[PDB]
Design an enzyme around this catalytic site. Structure first.
Site, short mmCIF file in Angstrom:
data_model
loop_
_atom_site.label_atom_id
_atom_site.label_comp_id
_atom_site.label_asym_id
_atom_site.label_seq_id
_atom_site.Cartn_x
_atom_site.Cartn_y
_atom_site.Cartn_z
N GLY A 22 0.76 -1.25 0.00
CA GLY A 22 0.00 0.00 0.00
C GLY A 22 0.79 1.30 0.00
N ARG A 23 0.08 2.38 -0.35
CA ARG A 23 0.62 3.75 -0.45
C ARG A 23 1.85 3.85 -1.39
CG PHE A 24 3.70 3.79 -5.71
CD1 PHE A 24 3.04 2.97 -6.62
CD2 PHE A 24 4.94 4.32 -6.07
CE1 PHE A 24 3.60 2.67 -7.86
CE2 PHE A 24 5.53 4.03 -7.30
CZ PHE A 24 4.85 3.19 -8.20
N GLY A 25 4.21 1.81 -1.65
CA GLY A 25 5.40 1.25 -1.00
C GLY A 25 5.76 -0.08 -1.65
CB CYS A 26 7.97 -2.08 -2.84
SG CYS A 26 9.53 -1.41 -2.55
CB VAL A 27 7.58 -5.53 1.48
CG1 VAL A 27 6.59 -6.54 0.88
CG2 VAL A 27 8.43 -6.19 2.55
CE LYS A 40 5.79 -2.21 5.95
NZ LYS A 40 4.73 -2.33 7.01
CG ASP A 143 -5.61 -1.70 6.55
OD1 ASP A 143 -6.74 -2.00 6.15
OD2 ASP A 143 -4.64 -1.61 5.81
N1 LIG Z 1 2.93 -5.07 5.76
C1 LIG Z 1 2.23 -5.80 5.23
C2 LIG Z 1 1.28 -6.63 4.52
C3 LIG Z 1 1.93 -7.46 3.41
C4 LIG Z 1 2.58 -6.84 2.34
C5 LIG Z 1 3.16 -7.63 1.33
C6 LIG Z 1 3.11 -9.03 1.41
N2 LIG Z 1 3.66 -9.76 0.42
C7 LIG Z 1 4.33 -10.91 0.63
N3 LIG Z 1 4.97 -11.13 1.81
C8 LIG Z 1 5.67 -12.26 2.04
N4 LIG Z 1 6.26 -12.41 3.26
C9 LIG Z 1 6.48 -11.40 4.15
C10 LIG Z 1 6.12 -10.09 4.12
C11 LIG Z 1 6.57 -9.60 5.29
C12 LIG Z 1 6.48 -8.16 5.83
C13 LIG Z 1 5.06 -7.59 5.98
C14 LIG Z 1 5.99 -7.06 4.87
N5 LIG Z 1 7.17 -10.60 6.00
N6 LIG Z 1 7.11 -11.63 5.31
C15 LIG Z 1 5.73 -13.25 1.01
C16 LIG Z 1 6.41 -14.48 1.16
C17 LIG Z 1 6.45 -15.42 0.12
C18 LIG Z 1 5.79 -15.14 -1.09
C19 LIG Z 1 5.09 -13.93 -1.24
C20 LIG Z 1 5.06 -12.99 -0.21
N7 LIG Z 1 4.38 -11.83 -0.37
C21 LIG Z 1 2.46 -9.65 2.49
C22 LIG Z 1 1.87 -8.86 3.48
#
Ligand SMILES: N#CCC1C=CC(=Nc2nc(Nc3cc(C4CC4)[nH]n3)c3ccccc3n2)C=C1
Length: 307
Positions: A22-27, A40, A143
């Site tokens: 969300g909010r054009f972020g990324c992880v 994040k 949320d």
């Molecule tokens: N904050 C928040 C919510 C969120 C944001 C992105 C998200 N994607 C995601 N997250 C994960 N795993 C994950 C994400 C996080 C952290 C919450 C960002 N910790 N672990 C995986 C693992 C394997 C395949 C695909 C994945 N997708 C999963 C949850």
């Protein structure tokens, strides 16, 4: 192939691959030393959410089996080109949403997810004096949704994403939410109606409504149904689809007072029947009638005990 590293607190880190949020972020899935973590990355435009999550994780007592583990946060880069990082633990099984998309859950799998999720949320909502690091305030998440519940390898749940979370101090009234609100789909009727000046108990009841919807998602993919298990759908998706307006939600939840369907054939199994009852109490139009997180946890323990 890469001998170049990024560094976080003098430790080497490499980015593996990205996922949107969300909010054009990324992880990113990253490797910090010899472990996987989640990095994040927030644009400077979403500094408020970054700061908020960092502050929340900086409160007393914010380390818990059922709370996504915080590793650290920092501003990175130059005065002019600023990135904001917040690093947490990485969970390979991902969010409960992605899990349920790809998998059905047994009754016992469902109880373990529900119970550990309720525990995390009950702990978040709990005011606790007397910790070595200080006095933990009650915290509303704001949320709650299956995407913000992460699953460990044994399906133990943890609550994630405190970018909108709001603490409450017994001293004062509810603080500044800065105009930020949650995922439309999961908004309680009173939020959809635009009721304002909520206080502690009201924010908590908002989380419990959304939690009802997450419990419905689990129920909807559980093999304890005496009947077929359909493909995964988000709450209200059957009715208003994958991209609803606020007006779509208001119509369906406020005006029509409708909820995701609890099928009668889900209720043969005595546990499920009780689950269904609990769900109905969590998503009641009347906020005051909703169950607390602690009470939901107890209900989940009972369902298990009976089965
Ligand atoms: N904050 C928040 C919510 C969120 C944001 C992105 C998200 N994607 C995601 N997250 C994960 N795993 C994950 C994400 C996080 C952290 C919450 C960002 N910790 N672990 C995986 C693992 C394997 C395949 C695909 C994945 N997708 C999963 C949850």
């Amino acid at each position: 192939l890469g001998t170049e590293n990024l560094y976080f607190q003098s430790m080497p880190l490499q980015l593996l691959e990205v996922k949107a949020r969300g909010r054009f972020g990324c992880v990113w899935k990253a490797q910090l030393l010899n472990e996987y973590v989640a990095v994040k990355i927030f644009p400077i435009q979403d500094k408020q959410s970054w700061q908020n999550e960092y502050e929340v994780y900086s409160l007393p007592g914010m380390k818990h089996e059922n709370i996504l583990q915080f590793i650290g946060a920092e501003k990175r880069g130059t005065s002019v080109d600023v990135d904001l990082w917040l690093i947490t633990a990485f969970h390979e099984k991902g969010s409960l949403s992605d899990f349920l998309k790809a998998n059905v859950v047994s009754w016992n799998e469902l109880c373990h997810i529900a119970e550990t999720m309720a525990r995390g949320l009950a702990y978040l909502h709990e005011d606790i004096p007397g910790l070595k690091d200080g006095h933990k305030p009650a915290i509303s998440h704001r949320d709650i949704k299956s995407k913000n519940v992460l699953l460990k390898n044994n399906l133990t749940a943890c609550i994630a994403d405190f970018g909108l979370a709001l603490k409450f101090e017994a001293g004062k009234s509810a603080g500044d939410t800065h105009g930020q609100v949650g995922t439309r789909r999961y908004m309680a009727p009173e939020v959809l109606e635009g009721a304002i000046n909520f206080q502690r108990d009201a924010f908590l009841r908002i989380d419990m409504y959304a939690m009802g919807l997450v419990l419905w998602e689990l129920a909807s993919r559980c093999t304890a149904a005496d009947g077929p298990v359909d493909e995964y759908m988000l709450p209200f998706e059957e009715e208003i689809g994958q991209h609803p307006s606020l007006e779509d939600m208001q119509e369906v939840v406020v005006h029509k007072k409708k909820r995701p369907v609890l099928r009668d054939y889900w209720q043969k199994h005595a546990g499920m029947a009780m689950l269904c009852e609990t769900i109905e109490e969590c998503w009641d139009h009347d906020a005051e009638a909703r169950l607390s997180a602690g009470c939901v946890g107890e209900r989940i323990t009972q369902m298990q005990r009976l089965t």
